[PDB]
Amino acid sequence: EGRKVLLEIADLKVHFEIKDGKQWFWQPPKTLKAVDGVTLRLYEGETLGVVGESGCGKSTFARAIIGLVKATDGHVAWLGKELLGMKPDEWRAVRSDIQMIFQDPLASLNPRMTIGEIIAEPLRTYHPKMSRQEVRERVKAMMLKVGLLPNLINRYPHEFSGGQCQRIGIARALILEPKLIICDEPVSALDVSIQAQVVNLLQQLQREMGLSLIFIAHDLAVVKHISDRVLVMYLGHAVELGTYDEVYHNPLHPYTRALMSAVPIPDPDLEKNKTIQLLEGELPSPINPPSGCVFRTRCPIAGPECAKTRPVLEGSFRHSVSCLKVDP
Amino acid sequence: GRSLWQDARRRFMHNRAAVASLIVLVLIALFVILAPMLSQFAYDDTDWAMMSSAPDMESGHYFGTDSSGRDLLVRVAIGGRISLMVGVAAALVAVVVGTLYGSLSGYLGGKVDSVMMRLLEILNSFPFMFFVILLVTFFGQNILLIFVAIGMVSWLDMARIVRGQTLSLKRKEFIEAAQVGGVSTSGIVIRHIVPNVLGVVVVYASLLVPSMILFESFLSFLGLGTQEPLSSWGALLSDGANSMEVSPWLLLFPAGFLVVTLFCFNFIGDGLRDALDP
């Protein structure tokens, strides 16, 4: 029943060692618990938005799926094959299907290479027997698809206006005909009108090629437009997971109520009249998360049971929460 | 298109100091090459009619004579061969050792980076001129020992800057994107990291050659250095410093070529710094 399950993630953890100069040389490293206890499944033809404050680990979660950072525990599976135990070579079979778009427009592109080479580098790496003519024609066709003029082929990435650089990044991801593309803050650096060009383009390409996306962003309002489901994160935990109607119109988790009421609205008669929720105290350091529930220091409805045990995602496909004191 | 090394070429040609320098440095190379071959006199020859004389255009001793009755024009050229060949050889050794240590320290990540950069800071606290003098006095002044000894003590800042550049590139996005594009570790090094590390290497190599010419010329001013049949500019300067009361040209000609040469490389290095890293 339903669409194909494309990617499954269960009990994923990413702990980084940290040994800062404030420790004695004798002492063990501390653990930066960047991600701890994410659990979800992503379907074919679906966009999952991942959203949260700085330090939520959404960028490390992205990097753990595609293999740029080694997961400490859990399982990730693509089309039924496990990813986290894989040898360095068999990752190439999976990366034919899984590709990525990155935070910084200029940094994403090698500054010593032309556009034609940057978009051709995946294609040349996966099809070594393909001719220089076929590679140039594939690249010109993909440039015309992302909205770059074909005669720009021989120009270098410093000649481009930042929004054009994320179009090169999209073209490089799509040249293989992938099935999941992961977007690590694809529109953070860009001007507001250009953000809407890149988001409309990703949403067109999803519909035109049949992709799934994992879309990671800081702006809740951008995430609502492109996503079908949203994962809300706090200090490496999954706090809420549901469809784009439920997570924004019926938020149950206290952090999502705070985050969605803190989102600013582009209407003077609404922004001055909304019921603002406010959180007591700073973001805890991810070098020493609180024991039990990690939101326990900021939560408006806290209680002593939340120090004794740690919540996990419970609920339906439509909506699920990690809280002891609310139930959908 | 705006090929970034052709913009660097345009910046280098616009910097008039740097082009001027390169002309000068090539004219010094042509003097150091040709003068012993075009000369009427040899490096080991003597004319006791002119035991020590100032420049005289009818004599053919155009730079005057050393107090053994011996020609300074030929000796300043032959000594320029030694100082430039030791300087370039020592720079090659320091560039290879420094690039290898810096690239491994930067690419292998935190574990190895931590200890390898600790060793540079510790080692930079040794008296390397005393340590090269200790090698040279205990093992006997061979020119091949001086190439290697000057190089093996002067790669530390070269390794520090190549480490900084390599660790920055290993953190950059287009290396993560090359891994996601299925590119092998050898492909990432050869086609993505090396072309971007190469800028720092060319700038610091060009700035390092004059320090090696100075280190040799110091080590040969005290004595030590290279012996009489293979005397460098620093060895001529000490015979000059003694002779200075009677025949001051024995400082001024060696000093002119050495100072000019060191000036030249400094402006070529700053021209490349400006060109490759605005």
């Binding site: 250009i194 309002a221 803190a262 105290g281 | -």
Partner: protein
């Protein structure tokens, strides 16, 4: 009407022009800018990169780069601010005018205890003793909702999160009780909850101290909270000016329409965002006449001339040639 808003002003800026002497030729980053402001008002200067909005703030403060040149006028309580010598401009810079900046991480001095970074304002401008300056700094940190203010005074700013560093900046800027606060993108570096706190704080402190605010941002969503008058800018030129309500509900200039459609929303569902086409503007080789010409859906041959900054409905400015009823 604007004839009245020119007369009762705290600040009245006429033909402000900012030009940078870059090697590619003179770049006019702000171009004949005109506006005025009164005690308790907020002006939201709004636009993307290349709009020049950040240079307007620095031109009023005299904080431009070395290669910058300022022309025009800025009348303030009957004095004139622009091109004053530093020894006289320093008499305005915290006692009457004040500023907060885009990056809270690098704006505080990392080599000094935060309490002295506050106290140096009061000891210079209000002639306080070091004893009075400490207690007034503590009262201002409490007004700014800083926790355990006395303990925080002895900290260096690397002990603090980016949200607390903007609180220190606001406490430091407002310490003298200014007439005007200028705010260059204060929340762009910060999370959504810290943004909602700092905008709620400024909206309360505006009412207690009776400051005017110039709020500079790309986020129309943040403008809608603090703002009373909006000033839309593109390529250094005024595109629209008027009441915040008016500009947000009846935007009369095509770029204002495109930007308020490109800004995403929670309140209603839809198929696509109605984005403005084309690349962001370059100030070198910017097109003559209207700067929005290579992007505009309503472009006409007359737009090769510069459009006049006319008024249509009393209290607004239009900067466009299309008839006002055809949008």
């Amino acid at each position: 009407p604007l004839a009245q808003q020119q007369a009762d002003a705290l600040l009245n800026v006429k033909d402000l022009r900012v030009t940078f002497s870059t090697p590619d030729g003179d770049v006019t980053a702000v171009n004949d800018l005109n506006f005025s402001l009164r005690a308790g008002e907020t002006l939201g200067i709004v636009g993307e990169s290349g709009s020049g909005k950040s240079q307007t703030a620095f031109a009023l403060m005299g904080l431009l780069a070395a290669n910058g040149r300022i022309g025009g006028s800025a009348t303030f309580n009957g004095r004139e601010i622009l091109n004053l010598p530093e020894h006289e401009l320093n008499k305005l810079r915290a006692e009457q005018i004040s500023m907060i900046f885009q990056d809270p991480m690098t704006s505080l001095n990392p080599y000094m205890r935060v309490g002295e970074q506050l106290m140096e304002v009061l000891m210079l401008h209000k002639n306080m003793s070091k004893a009075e300056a400490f207690e007034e700094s503590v009262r201002m940190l409490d007004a700014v909702k800083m926790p355990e203010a006395r303990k925080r005074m002895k900290m260096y700013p690397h002990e603090f999160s980016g949200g607390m560093r903007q609180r220190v900046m606001i406490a430091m800027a407002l310490l003298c009780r200014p007439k005007l606060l200028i705010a260059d993108e204060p929340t762009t570096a910060l999370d959504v909850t810290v943004q909602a706190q700092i905008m709620t704080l400024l909206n309360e402190l505006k009412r207690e101290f009776n400051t005017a605010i110039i709020m500079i941002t790309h986020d129309l969503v943040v403008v809608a909270g603090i703002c009373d008058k909006v000033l839309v800018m593109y390529a250094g030129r005024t595109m629209e000016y008027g009441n915040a309500r008016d500009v947000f509900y009846q935007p009369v200039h095509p770029y204002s329409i495109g930007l308020l459609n490109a800004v995403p929303r929670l309140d209603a569902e839809g198929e696509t965002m109605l984005t403005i086409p084309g690349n962001p503007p370059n100030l070198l080789r910017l097109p003559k006449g209207c700067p929005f010409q290579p992007r505009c859906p309503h472009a006409m041959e007359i737009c090769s001339s510069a459009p006049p900054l006319e008024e249509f409905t009393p209290g607004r400015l239009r900067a466009c040639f299309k008839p006002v009823e055809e949008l």
